[PDB]
Amino acid sequence: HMTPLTPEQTHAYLHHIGIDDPGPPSLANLDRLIDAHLRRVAFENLDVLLDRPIEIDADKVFAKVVEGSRGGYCFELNSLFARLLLALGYELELLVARVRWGLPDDAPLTQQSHLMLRLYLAEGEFLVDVGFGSANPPRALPLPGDEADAGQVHCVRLVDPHAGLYESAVRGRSGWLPLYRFDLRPQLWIDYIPRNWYTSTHPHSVFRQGLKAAITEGDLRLTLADGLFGQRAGNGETLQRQLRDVEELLDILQTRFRLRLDPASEVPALARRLAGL
Q1: What CATH number has the domain bearing residue 116?
Q2: If you write DSSP's letter for every residue of 189-246 in order, what string do you get?
Q3: With contact defined as beta carbons under 8 Å apart, do 152 and 146 qualify?
C-alpha cells in the first residue's frame, strides 16, 4: 500500500536532501524538493549489478536511500518520494509509462515499465519524476505544458486525444522527442511488483547489462554509462570521458554521485564486477 512516511522518516529524509522547512504544498515548494532530491540522491543500478534483490517496500527503500546514502532507479526513488510528498500533504496518483527515450517513433511498442507521479495542486496538475536518470526533467512539469513556450524544453503533450495518450517530451529539431508515453489511469501500488521484478531480474533488462547512473551537480547532469562519464549542461553541450580504470570509477561513484559504499562488503565485490565495464 502507498501510505505516507512517518514523521520521524519525513524529518530524516528532509534532512538528508538538505531541506529544513519544506513549507506548505505549492509548485514552488515542490520544485525545491525535486531539485534537492536530484542533487542528493543518484539514479543508480549498483545493487542490480551485485545481483542483490531490489525491494520496493517503504521501510526497505527508506533504509537504503536515507539511512544508507544510496540511490536507486525509478521504482525505488519515485515511490519513496511519493511517500514523502504524501506526508507533506500533497495529493497525488501513481502513473505508469512506456519508455521511448532514444527510440524512433518507428520502433515497436515497449512495456509499461516506468513509475511517475501525478500531483494535484490548487494551482494545476503536474507530472513529477525524480527517477528517470539521465534525461530526468529538473522540475515538476505542468500536465500538459505549453508547446508555444520556448522556455519549456521539457513539455508534457496530449498526443492522441481519442486514446487519452500523453508523452513527456523534449524539444527537438525534428519534432518532440518522447521520454515516455502514458495514459492517466491511476495505478495501484501492488501492480509495480511485477514491473520491478522484471527490471531487476529479467536477463534482457537494460539494468542488468551495465552500469547506469545519474545525478545533478551545479549546472550539470552527470551520468555514467558503464565506464563513460558524461557531464551535460542541460541544454546539451556534453563533455564525455572514458574512465581509465575501476579505481577512478569507484572514486567518482563515491564522490560525484555521493554514494556510500561499504569498504568491506561492497567495494571489493564492485571492483571485480565493474572491471569488465
Answers
A1: 2.40.128.150
A2: GGGHHHHHHHHHH-TT-GGGTS-EEEEEETTEEEEEETTEEEEE-SSS-EEEEE-SSH
A3: yes
Interatomic CA distance for residues 61 and 100, integer angstroms: 26
Resolution in A: 2.0
Query: How far, in Å, CA of 47 to CA of 25, rounded?
Result: 33
Cell digits of residue 150: 520556448
Spacing of C-alpha 1 from chain mean position: 20
Q: Same domain, yes or no, for 173 and 257?
A: no
Catalytic residue set = 74, 114, 129
Same domain, 80 and 143: no
User: Which experimental approach was used here?
Assistant: X-ray
- CATH code at position 273: 3.30.2140.10
Q: In the listed set 188, 210, 241, which residue is the last one of a domain according to the structure?
A: 188
Q: Same structural domain for residues 148 and 232?
A: no
**HEC string of 48-64?**
HHCCCCCCCCHHHHHHH
Partnered with residue 229 across adjacent β-strands are: 224, 241
- What ranges in 68-133 are assigned the alpha helix state H? 74-87
The DSSP 8-state label assigned to residue 172 in this structure reads -
